Antibody, heavy 233, light 211 residues
Framework: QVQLQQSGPGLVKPSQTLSLTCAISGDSVSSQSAAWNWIRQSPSRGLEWLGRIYYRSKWYNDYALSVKSRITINPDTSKNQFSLQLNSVTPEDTAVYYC?????????????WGQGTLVTVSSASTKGPSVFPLAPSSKSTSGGTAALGCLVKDYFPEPVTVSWNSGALTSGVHTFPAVLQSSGLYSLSSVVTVPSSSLGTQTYICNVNHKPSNTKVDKKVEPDYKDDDDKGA | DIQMTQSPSSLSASVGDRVTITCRASQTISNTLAWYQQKPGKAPKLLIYAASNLQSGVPSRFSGSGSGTDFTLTISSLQPEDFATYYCQQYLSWFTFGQGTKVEIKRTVAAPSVFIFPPSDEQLKSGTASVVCLLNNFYPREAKVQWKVDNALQSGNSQESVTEQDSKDSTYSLSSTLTLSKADYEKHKVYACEVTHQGLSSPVTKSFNRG
């Protein structure tokens, strides 16, 4: 099957150039039975097709009128990729950008999509998060359920990903949408409910990844000062 | 250019219900229509193309009908995993999309399970205290969370976040975070989260005493 893997920075300063790449597996960028597209999504643009590239014994491009003066979509036949370049960005360009394949020219819909790349247009610097445990009270576990979590605070830009036990724990996980604080930095929490009986047989670790700052933090979340390496009191 | 308009903008339906959503093109497009399903944090997924052709790997409960200017997407028997925003798109011309219709699952009332988390000692070292209140797996979405510090109602120092509807049990979860300076935090003893929800006979309070 065909897969599209996106890459490129998710933070662009106003007036500068957005640059993204879409790497194809299982098909050729020069296929004469496909067209390669970029489509963005945001509250201001809704889902908006931006343009396409396709090869028919010659390279062809088509660009949406909204972005025609600022956009370039180029193929790379050595790496089997296609790029998106959008010059002179403004805050109206903040969106999730997707690459997508259209069978033929796109006259049967877009069946294959990349994972999307959130691009934030901002002058603010990247900042990795601080990660704090959300440890429940011993009393709150008496009902058979223990809620545990991680607070992922003061990062920029979005997004952050949170897994539990390196992806082994998915049931009962809730990772909340981030909120933008008055400081202009984001914060979110990720929680999981588990059986209280598991608190002394199972270890719970949240794995936080903030790709813009290359920050990876793995925080163990348990409820006993006795066994601490660093002693207080 | 061609404008695509979906109706309704949102709907709530029970599991097993037949759901119909419409898409109107501003000019005739014959059969040049696709329908997509988009779940939170995921790319749109193609469901139907050529107005009525089911895409490979999509369940047969999804069907498309219509022609010309008026199109319909039908879900014959709504499943909890069908919570999503659905989009139509024309490809007679330059690939324009409808604005989407959000489909939510109507289910029985479920009270939240409430949990309160004090700030970590590590965060306190840094000069700030975040106190978190969690409302887990409730329905419907409407809920009131009030913070009390030494029995004084708080205002303007908390932020809420709500998850999208769960794909398995059709509930919501909510976080409320109260943010104070370390100095303000250490000036008080009792931190309480008071929750009001249709599933609770009276408001539920979860609290802790600092230290």
């Amino acid at each position: 099957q065909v897969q599209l893997q996106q890459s490129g920075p998710g933070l662009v300063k106003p007036s500068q150039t957005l640059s993204l790449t879409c790497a194809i597996s299982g098909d050729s960028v020069s296929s004469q039975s496909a067209a390669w597209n970029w489509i963005r999504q945001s509250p201001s643009r809704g889902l908006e097709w931006l343009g396409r590239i396709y090869y028919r014994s010659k390279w062809y491009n088509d660009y949406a009128l909204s972005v025609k003066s600022r956009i370039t979509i180029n193929p790379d036949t050595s790496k089997n990729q296609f790029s998106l370049q959008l010059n002179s960005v403004t805050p109206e360009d903040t969106a999730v950008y997707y690459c997508a394949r259209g069978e033929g020219y796109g006259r049967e819909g877009f069946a294959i999509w990349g994972q999307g790349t959130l691009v934030t247009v901002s002058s603010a610097s990247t900042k990795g998060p601080s990660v704090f445990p959300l440890a429940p009270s011993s009393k709150s576990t008496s009902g058979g359920t223990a809620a545990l979590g991680c607070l992922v605070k003061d990062y920029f830009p979005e997004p952050v990903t949170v897994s539990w036990n390196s992806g082994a724990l998915t049931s009962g996980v809730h990772t909340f949408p981030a909120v933008l604080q008055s400081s202009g930095l984001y914060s979110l929490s990720s929680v999981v409910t588990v059986p209280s009986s598991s608190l002394g047989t199972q270890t719970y670790i949240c794995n936080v990844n903030h790709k813009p700052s290359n920050t990876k933090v793995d925080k163990k979340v348990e409820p006993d000062y006795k066994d601490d390496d660093d002693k207080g009191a | 250019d061609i404008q695509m308009t979906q109706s309704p903008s949102s709907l709530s339906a029970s599991v097993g219900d037949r759901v119909t959503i419409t898409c109107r093109a501003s000019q005739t497009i014959s059969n040049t229509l696709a329908w997509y399903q988009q779940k939170p944090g995921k790319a749109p997924k193609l469901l139907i193309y050529a107005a009525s052709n089911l895409q490979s790997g999509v369940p047969s409960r999804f069907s498309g009908s219509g022609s010309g200017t008026d199109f319909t997407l039908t879900i014959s028997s709504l499943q909890p995993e069908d919570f999503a925003t659905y989009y139509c798109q024309q490809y007679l011309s330059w690939f324009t999309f409808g604005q989407g219709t959000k489909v939510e699952i109507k289910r029985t009332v479920a009270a939240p399970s409430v949990f309160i988390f004090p700030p970590s000692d590590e965060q306190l070292k840094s000069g700030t205290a975040s106190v978190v209140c969690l409302l887990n797996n409730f329905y419907p979405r409407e809920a009131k969370v009030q913070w009390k510090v030494d029995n004084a109602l708080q205002s303007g120092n908390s932020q809420e976040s709500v998850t999208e509807q769960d794909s398995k049990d059709s509930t919501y979860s909510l976080s409320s975070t109260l943010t104070l300076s370390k100095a303000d935090y250490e000036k008080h003893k009792v931190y309480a989260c008071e929750v009001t929800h249709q599933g609770l006979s009276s408001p539920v309070t979860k609290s802790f005493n600092r230290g």
